[PDB]
């Protein structure tokens, strides 16, 4: 029953982490679209599971994304 887009929608205003094409991320999701571009707050940059820096307010481009996770 649960498709991806609705899951994504649900997960707005909640913690998420993103891997890339590689470095892990960690932040609260602000909003999403059809193309799967992201906008996050309280972004922390997990360099292979090592929080290098806390950027805060960020916007991730879709094509570099690998997966979403809580």
């Amino acid at each position: 029953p649960v498709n991806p887009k609705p899951f994504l929608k649900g997960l707005v205003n909640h913690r998420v982490g993103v891997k890339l094409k590689s470095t892990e991320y960690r932040g609260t999701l602000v909003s999403t679209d059809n193309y799967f571009n992201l906008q996050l707050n309280e972004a922390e940059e997990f360099v292979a599971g090592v929080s290098h820096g806390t950027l805060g307010e960020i916007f991730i481009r879709c094509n570099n994304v690998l997966y979403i996770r809580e």
């Binding site: 890339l20 307010e57 960020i58 916007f59």
Partner: protein, 65 residues
């Protein structure tokens, strides 16, 4: 605002234009990278007045208050 990029270029710059592709016209442009030989540690950055940018390059844009 600062932008992370595919080729390891931290683009600190003033945004002018914006579109579907996340291409950007940029003023007050200050890129940050590192030209290095193996076992070489150098940190380089250059000022540019006006600069167009392509969107596939962009990984993550960010805003430092």
């Amino acid at each position: 605002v600062i932008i992370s990029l595919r080729n390891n270029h931290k683009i600190i710059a003033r945004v002018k234009a914006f579109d579907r592709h996340c291409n950007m016209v940029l003023e007050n442009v200050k890129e940050l990278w590192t030209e290095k030989k193996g076992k070489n540690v150098i940190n380089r950055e250059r000022f540019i007045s006006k600069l167009f940018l392509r969107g596939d390059s962009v990984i993550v844009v960010l805003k430092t208050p």
